[PDB]
């Protein structure tokens, strides 16, 4: 929908550092003052390397009660597999937060997603907090 918040510009700064340097792990991004996507959280331990453990920290940083964009490098062997690093655009949208915020998440996610190259899959999750882990991984492994 056509509702009104624009993307900040460290937005794309820090999603390049994780794409191209490689400095981030994952990013957590989130709408502020409800007009303006921001940096959240930002992981810098580029010496994280198990995806279980990289969906642990992604999950301790959400809530049930916000959404959230996640950008994540996940660590993901091939049918071979040799570990290949595949960036997955994450919409964490859960049931108890409140419409007014739900719809505007929604309605912006796409104003973030195409400034965003390179993302290997874009999910969309809205489970409880509790699944979240266990659906992600589903997810991630069911292709």
Same mark, same amino acid.
């Given at each position: 929908?056509?509702? !009104?918040?624009?993307?900040?510009?460290? @937005? &794309?700064y820090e999603f390049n550092r994780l794409k191209?340097?490689?400095?981030?792990?994952?990013?957590?991004?989130?709408?502020?003052?409800?007009?303006? &996507?921001?940096?959240?959280?930002?992981e810098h331990d580029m010496e994280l390397t198990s995806l279980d453990?990289?969906?642990?920290?992604?999950?301790?940083?959400?809530?049930?009660?916000? @959404?959230?964009?996640?950008? *994540?490098?996940? +660590?993901? %062997?091939? %049918?071979? !597999?040799?570990?290949?690093?595949?960036?997955?655009? &994450?919409?964490?949208? +859960? !049931?108890?937060?409140? +419409?007014?915020?739900?719809?505007?998440? *929604? *309605?912006?996610?796409?104003?973030?997603?195409?400034? $965003?190259? !390179? $993302?290997?899959?874009?999910?969309? &999750?809205? @489970?409880?907090?509790?699944?979240?882990?266990?659906?992600?991984? *589903?997810? $991630?492994?069911?292709?």
């Amino acid at each position: 929908m056509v509702s !009104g918040v624009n993307v900040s510009d460290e @937005c &794309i700064y820090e999603f390049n550092r994780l794409k191209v340097k490689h400095l981030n792990k994952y990013i957590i991004y989130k709408i502020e003052n409800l007009e303006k &996507i921001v940096v959240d959280v930002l992981e810098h331990d580029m010496e994280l390397t198990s995806l279980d453990n990289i969906i642990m920290r992604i999950k301790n940083n959400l809530k049930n009660t916000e @959404c959230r964009y996640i950008i *994540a490098d996940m +660590p993901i %062997p091939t %049918p071979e !597999g040799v570990l290949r690093d595949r960036i997955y655009f &994450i919409f964490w949208s +859960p !049931g108890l937060s409140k +419409p007014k915020e739900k719809m505007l998440y *929604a *309605a912006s996610k796409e104003s973030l997603v195409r400034k $965003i190259n !390179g $993302i290997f899959k874009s999910l969309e &999750i809205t @489970c409880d907090i509790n699944e979240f882990e266990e659906e992600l991984k *589903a997810i $991630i492994l069911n292709t």
